[PDB]
Design an enzyme around this catalytic site. Structure first.
Site, short mmCIF file in Angstrom:
data_model
loop_
_atom_site.label_atom_id
_atom_site.label_comp_id
_atom_site.label_asym_id
_atom_site.label_seq_id
_atom_site.Cartn_x
_atom_site.Cartn_y
_atom_site.Cartn_z
N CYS A 170 0.85 -1.35 -0.10
CA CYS A 170 0.14 -0.06 -0.03
C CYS A 170 0.77 1.23 -0.20
O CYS A 170 0.48 2.26 -0.43
CB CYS A 170 -0.96 -0.08 1.20
SG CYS A 170 -1.58 -1.63 1.52
N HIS A 174 -7.97 3.79 -4.15
CA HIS A 174 -6.58 3.23 -3.47
C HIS A 174 -5.97 2.48 -4.49
O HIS A 174 -5.78 1.13 -4.26
CB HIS A 174 -7.09 2.49 -2.13
CG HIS A 174 -5.78 2.28 -1.40
ND1 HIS A 174 -4.61 2.77 -1.79
CD2 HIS A 174 -5.50 1.43 -0.53
CE1 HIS A 174 -3.83 2.38 -0.67
NE2 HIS A 174 -4.27 1.53 -0.05
N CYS A 221 -1.24 2.85 6.28
CA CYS A 221 -1.10 1.41 6.91
C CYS A 221 -0.79 0.63 5.61
O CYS A 221 -0.77 0.92 4.28
CB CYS A 221 -2.49 1.03 7.51
SG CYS A 221 -4.02 1.01 6.31
N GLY A 240 -0.55 -3.72 4.36
CA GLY A 240 -1.02 -5.24 4.35
C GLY A 240 0.04 -5.89 5.05
O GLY A 240 1.30 -5.44 4.93
#
Lengths: 400, 399, 402, 401
Positions: free
Chosen positions: B90, B354, B384, B386
C-alpha cells in the site's frame, strides 16, 4: 553523511533449476539467511532492527506481496520490524544494500538487513485477465526468465532481445571472440574449483534444511562444473546460431538462492556488539541501450569512481557479475583491466556459481568483503549488468 | 543542512476497477506522469536525471521486470536514465519518494523522480509450476487483491486475514462504532465533492489519452459525492451482520499513477526548477498483520520523535483512508479529533480510491498542494500497509 | 437385420497413470490398434472401410475434435475413410462396437472398425472463459477423473458423488461386505496372473513403440499378481474407516486403446476375412447417479428380455470391475455366484485397469478370445457408467460344422 | 431394416458469439429442446424413451462427460433413460439422428430423441499437464474453434489449415469466384429474411428465458441474420487470408450457440404413444476427403447415399446443404449438377444468415428440411454438410402422406 558498516553476511548455497533448492518456497528461502544472522549474532536486540531490505526480480510467485516482510516474519524476527522489497532485476540484491546504506548514512536508521532472493525453479506462470466478456485472447507465460506481457511500443523502439541475444550483441559491437569468452569461462570454473576445495565457499554458506523420508541438508553450491576443459567449451553450439558466440558454457544459468548482510551506523555497531568488517563508500547506477545491457557496468563504475575520485587501480578486489563472458570481457576492456586479472572474480563468478537474479548482487558484496579479509586488501568494487539496460556499482573498504 | 526539495508533482485521474483507465497497461499508465513532468519542465536537461523510483505492489502483470525502467523508456526519457521499483504494498509510492529523498540527502544523487503506479483492473492470474510429472494439483489465483501462494507457516503464526477483516479487528480492538466509521466516510465524500467543484483535483491531474477515435480521461472516477449517512447506515458489513466494515466506509480497488521531482539545492539552481517543499524525513514501523490498519501510529511516532515535533506541529495530515475504522483508530491514538479539518481536508481514499503503488505518492503530492492553497507550513503523510506496517513522511513548504 | 461378424481384434497394453504409456499422445495411442489391424490383414482393400467408430470419455486433450478421424489418418488409413467418436463415459468403447453393429445390421455399411482410447495420464486442465471484462472468477480443473464445470441444478437434484463414493453407496444399499469385495479383488488378481503366465494377454496385445533409442511396451502395467487377502484387508477405505471401497478392491486410472473389425457376410467374403463371432445385440439403461455401479442389472435384463435368453445361456460374462462392491451387487441381482468361473475368467479391471473409452472395447475383445479358448458359445459384456448408466452387448462364437 | 419416423422436432434460436444465449450453460441449453419435446407431447410415457443421442463437437466445457445424459437429467426426463454423445465435429447433430435411426431400423429400440448442442461462446481454454517437474512448456489454447494440441505428424502429412483457408483452397481448386460467393451469401440473407418475416423460423423455435437482476429476457429470434446485407457491402469486405483470396466474414457462417432435438419412433411406438409420424428416414452416408479441401466432403457422401437408395439428385424437392462457406456450398452444388441459385437448395436461407453452432447444425438441417417439405407438399429431402478434417455426411428423408 555518517559512516555505514557491513557486519555479518551469509548466503544459502546456490542450486540449479529443478535442483537441490527447488522444493524450498521463495519466502522460506529468503528466511534462511535472516534466521542465520539472528543465530550468529546473539548479543543483538532484534527489536531495534530498523528495516529488512530484500531484492527480488520476480515477486509473482511465493515471493509476492513484499517478500522482505514475509521473510522476516517467517525468520522469527519481531512483528515490529518493517520490510521493503527492491526490483532492479539482476542487481536487486546490490540495490537493497545501497538503499539500506543511504538510509543509515543520512541518519534515518541505525541498523538494517539488506540482501536478496530468487527462486527461478518456482517462478510461476502469469495469465492476463480477459479485457472482454468471453475473450478468446488469453495466454500463459513462464516467469522463470525472459519477457512477458510485451509492450509493442517497447519492442518497436528498444527490442525485446533475450539476455543471450544481448550478450551476442555485446560480443559483435565490442569484438569479443568465442575463444576469449571460453578462456574466461574456464578461468571462472578453475578459480571456483580451487575456492570450493579450500572451503572458501563453505565459510560464506549457511545450510538449508529440506523436510522430505527424512530431513536433508543442502550445504554445497550445485552449479559449478570444475572439470570443464577449453576443448569441451569449444564444442558447444551457440544459443543463437552457428555464427554467434554465446553458449550455455560461457554464460551463467537459472538458479535459486538467498543472501543477507547486516549494515549499521557507528552507534549501532557499539550498542549491539557487532564486528564492523567494512565501510560502504557508495553506489551508482546507469542506463544503457537494452540491446547491449551487458555493458551497463562501465558507465555505473565510471559514475561511482568519478564521485569517489578514485581510479579502477585503487581496488584490490573487483566482483563483476559473470552473466555472460562476452559482457564481462567487454566491461573489463572498456575500464582498462586485463581479461585475466587476478583482482577480478579471484574465486570465480556466476558462470561457475549460477545467477539467482535477486540474490546475485548481495552475493557479490558479501564475497568481495570475504576475499578482502583473506587477502588483507583495502578497497572492493562490486558491479553488474541489468536486464533492459542498466549497470549498478557499489564500493566498500575493509575496516583496519 | 543538505536540503532535498520536491518540485513539480502530477498524477493521473484514479479509475474504478474495470473503469475509465482499465484499457491502459500498467507500464503505459506509469509513463503518463513521467512524460507530463518532462513536458511541463522543458528547461531541464533530462539526461541529468539520476534515477526513476516507482512504487508498485503487484509486478506480476504489465508492471513486471522493473516498471520504473519500463515506464521511463516508454515516457521518452533517455535510455541513460536508470530506474528501480519498490514494493511496500500500500505504501510503495511513499517509499519511492522517501528512497529518492535519502539518495539525494546523503550526496549520492542530485535529481530524481519518485512516484507509483497500480493497474488493479489488469492484475493477472498466477499459476504455480507442477512439481511432478503429470501433476494434477495446479490452480490459478487472482492477484487483483489479497493472499496468493499462502505459506501455511504464515497462516498458523500471523493469519491471512483479508484487508476488510483486519479493519473489523481494529474496529473491535480499538472500539470504533459503525456510526463513527460512516460519519468519517460521509465527511470524505463531502470534502472530496467540494474539492472537485473547486477544481483542486484538476490542478493535480494530467490527462490519460485512450486510443479507440481518441478520448481523454481527466476526472477521478471513484467519488460518490451524493452519498448520505442513511445510504451508508443501510449497507451490510463485508464479514457479517455483527461487524462494522462495509463497501461504503472503505476504499475500493483502483487504477492510477503519480510522479514527483526531487532535487538538491544545486540541481534546483542548475535546472531552473521551482522548489515547493523540503523533505523532513520518513519512518516505517511493523505491527501485527491482523490489525495492520494501526501501522501509522508507531510510524508517525518514530518520525515525530526523530524530528522533535508533536502532531499539532502539522497544518495538513494526509492519512490514507483504507478503512474509516483504522483512520479513526489512528487519529484517536495520536490525539487528533475524529473530524479534524487538518486531516484529509479535501477527502481521501474512501472517495478517491486506492491504487496501491500510487496512493503513497498521491498523499505527498496533495499534502503539498493543500499547504500551498492554505499558506500552511508542515505536512504529514501516513498510511497502513498489508501484513502489518505503517509509513510516515513529513514535508515543509519553502519560504 | 443381416448378421454382423467380429473379425480381428487387438489392444495396446494398459498403462498406469504417469507410467509406461504416459508419453504417448491420446491420438497416436488410438492409431496403434488401427495400424496393427491394417498390417495384420494385408489381404484387405482398406479403401473399402466404411467408418472408424471410437469411444473416448474425455475429448478435451490430444483426443479433441473427433479422435476417430485423427487416429485413422495417423494410422495410415486412406483420407477417404470417415470416423466418428462416441462418449458414454466408461462404456464409450462398447457403444462404438454396438453402433458399428447397428449400422451394418440395417445395411447402411459393410465393413467398420470400432474401438476406444483413453489417456487419463495426459487428460488436460480446463478453464472457463471470463463472462465479464476483467473477470476475477476464473479457475482451472483437472479432467483426469471426476466432476468439472459442476451444474448447481445437477448437484442439488442428483448429487456429484465421486465414483468411489457411488461404490460405497452400492455396498451400503445392496449390503456388500468389505471381506466379499476383498475376496472378489483377490480372485481378479489371481485369475489375471494365471492368464498372464499362460500368454493369454500377449495374444490380445500389439506393442506400443516409445521414441527416446526406441523401446517397446508389451505387457499390462496395472496387475498385482502377488496380492494377498491379508494385504487387501490392511488397506484404509477411500471415504473413511466405516466404509468398504479401497484402492485394492477398485480399478485405477489408466491409458490404453483397442479396435475390432466388424463385417457383413458380403464384406467377409469380398475381403477374405475370418469371422470369429456374430453380434447378437446391445442395450442401455439409466439408474440413479448415486448408485451408478448397479447400471448393468437393467441393461443386461433389457438385452436378455429382447434376445429371449436367461443369464445361464452365457458361457462367458465380462462384467467391468470398476469396483468389487458393484460387481458383486450386479452378480447377486442377476442370480450369478460371487465366484462364478463364467464371470471374468481371466480377471478384470481391478488387475488390468480402466482406461474409460477403451475398457468396453477390451471386454468384447477378451470375451470372444475366452470363448475361442474354452470352446464356449455365447458371451455377454456389461459395464456401469458414471452418472448412472449400464450397457450390455452379447456375442456368439461362429461354430464350424463337420 | 424396418421403417423409422421423425415425429415432433424443435430448436432454440441460434445466438451470436457472446450474444443472446451466451449466459446459458451448454448442458442447460441442450436441456431446453428436451424439456419442450416433453411439454409438447404429453401423450408419451417418457419412461419408454430408449435413448437420448446428442451431437457435440467440443465436450471440454459445461458439455463435458456425456452432455446427452447431463441434459436429459436437467430436462426432467426420468433417470431410467440413458444418453450418449456423438462427435463428428460439424455433422455431430446429423450423426445423432442417423445413429438413433439405425438403432430403431434394426429393432434394438422403439423410441429415441436425437439432436445436438454447441455453446461456442462458453467453449473453455485447455492446458496440457506438465510432463516434467517444474516444466516451463505449458500453454493454454482457446477451444471456441480451430486446432489445439496439434500433432506434428498430422501437420506434416495433412496440414492444419483453419476452416476459412480450406474454403479458399476449395475456391482455388474448384474455381469458385468471389462474385459467385458473395451472390450466394446475398441469396442466403434474402431467403432467410423472407423466411423470418413469414414466421417460418418461429414455427421451429422454442424460446429460451434468461434470468438475472435486470429481469427476464425472452430469447425467441435467430440473432445472426443480417437481412439488410447488400452485394456492394459484401464486395467491400477484406478476405480472411489476404487480398489474393476470396473467403470473407460475409460469404462464410460464424461462431454461434444453439440446441435442437427430434423424436424418432418405430410404427408400433408411433401407435402406442400417440405420435404424429411426419417423415420416414431413408438413410445416412459418410465419406472422407482431404482435410485441406474439407468443404467438398458432401459430394462423395451424397453420391454414396444416392447410389445405395437408387435416387438421382433431382428426386429431392428440398436440399439443405450447410453453408459453412459459400465457396464449398457452390463447389458441392456444381459437382452434384444442381444450379448455384436453385430454389430447391436452402429455400429459407442457410448458415451464412443463421449461424453454425457445430453440434446443433446437422440436427437443424434435418428439422428444417422436414419443415420445408410439410409447407411445400414436397416428397423427399436431402440434408448434407462438410466436416472439419475432411468429411461429409448426408441424410435423406421422405414426407409421410
Amino acid at each position: 553523511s555518517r559512516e555505514v558498516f557491513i557486519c555479518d553476511a551469509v548466503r544459502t548455497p546456490i542450486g540449479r533449476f529443478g535442483g537441490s533448492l527447488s522444493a524450498v518456497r521463495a519466502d522460506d528461502l529468503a528466511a534462511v539467511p535472516l534466521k542465520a544472522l539472528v543465530e550468529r549474532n546473539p548479543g543483538v536486540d532484534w527489536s531495534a532492527l530498523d528495516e529488512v531490505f530484500l531484492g527480488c526480480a520476480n515477486q509473482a510467485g511465493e515471493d509476492n506481496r513484499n517478500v522482505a516482510r514475509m521473510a522476516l516474519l517467517l525468520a522469527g524476527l519481531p512483528e515490529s520490524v518493517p520490510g521493503v522489497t527492491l526490483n532492479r532485476l539482476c542487481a536487486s540484491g546490490m540495490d537493497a544494500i545501497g538503499t539500506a546504506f543511504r538510509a543509515i548514512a543520512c541518519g534515518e536508521m541505525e541498523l538494517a538487513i539488506a540482501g536478496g532472493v530468487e527462486s527461478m525453479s518456482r517462478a510461476p506462470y502469469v495469465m492476463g485477465k480477459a479485457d472482454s466478456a468471453f475473450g478468446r485472447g488469453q495466454k500463459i507465460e513462464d516467469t522463470t526468465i525472459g519477457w512477458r506481457f510485451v509492450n509493442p511500443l517497447m519492442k518497436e523502439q528498444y527490442g525485446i532481445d533475450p539476455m543471450p541475444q544481448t550478450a551476442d550483441n555485446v560480443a559483435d559491437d565490442y569484438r569479443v571472440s568465442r575463444a576469449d569468452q571460453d578462456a574466461f569461462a574456464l578461468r571462472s570454473q578453475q578459480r571456483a574449483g580451487r575456492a570450493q576445495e579450500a572451503g572458501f565457499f563453505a565459510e560464506e554458506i549457511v545450510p538449508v534444511t529440506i523436510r522430505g523420508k527424512g530431513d536433508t541438508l543442502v550445504e554445497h553450491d550445485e552449479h559449478p562444473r570444475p572439470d570443464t576443459t577449453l576443448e569441451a567449451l569449444a564444442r558447444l553450439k551457440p544459443v543463437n546460431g552457428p555464427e554467434k558466440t554465446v553458449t550455455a558454457g560461457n554464460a551463467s544459468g537459472v538458479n535459486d538462492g538467498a543472501a543477507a548482510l547486516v549494515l549499521a551506523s557507528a552507534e549501532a555497531v557499539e550498542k549491539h556488539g557487532l564486528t564492523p568488517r567494512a565501510r560502504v563508500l557508495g553506489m551508482a547506477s546507469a542506463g544503457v541501450a537494452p540491446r547491449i545491457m551487458g555493458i551497463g557496468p562501465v558507465p555505473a563504475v565510471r559514475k561511482l569512481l568519478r564521485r569517489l575520485d578514485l581510479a579502477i587501480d585503487a581496488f584490490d578486489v573487483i566482483e563483476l557479475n559473470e552473466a555472460f563472458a562476452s559482457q564481462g570481457l567487454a566491461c573489463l576492456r572498456e575500464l582498462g583491466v586485463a581479461d585475466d586479472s587476478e583482482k577480478v572474480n579471484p574465486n570465480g563468478g556466476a558462470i561457475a556459481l549460477g545467477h539467482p537474479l535477486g540474490m546475485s548482487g548481495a552475493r557479490l558484496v558479501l564475497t568481495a568483503l570475504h576475499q578482502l579479509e583473506k587477502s588483507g586488501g583495502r578497497r572492493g568494487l562490486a558491479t553488474m549488468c541489468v536486464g533492459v539496460g542498466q549497470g549498478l556499482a557499489l564500493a566498500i573498504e575493509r575496516v583496519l
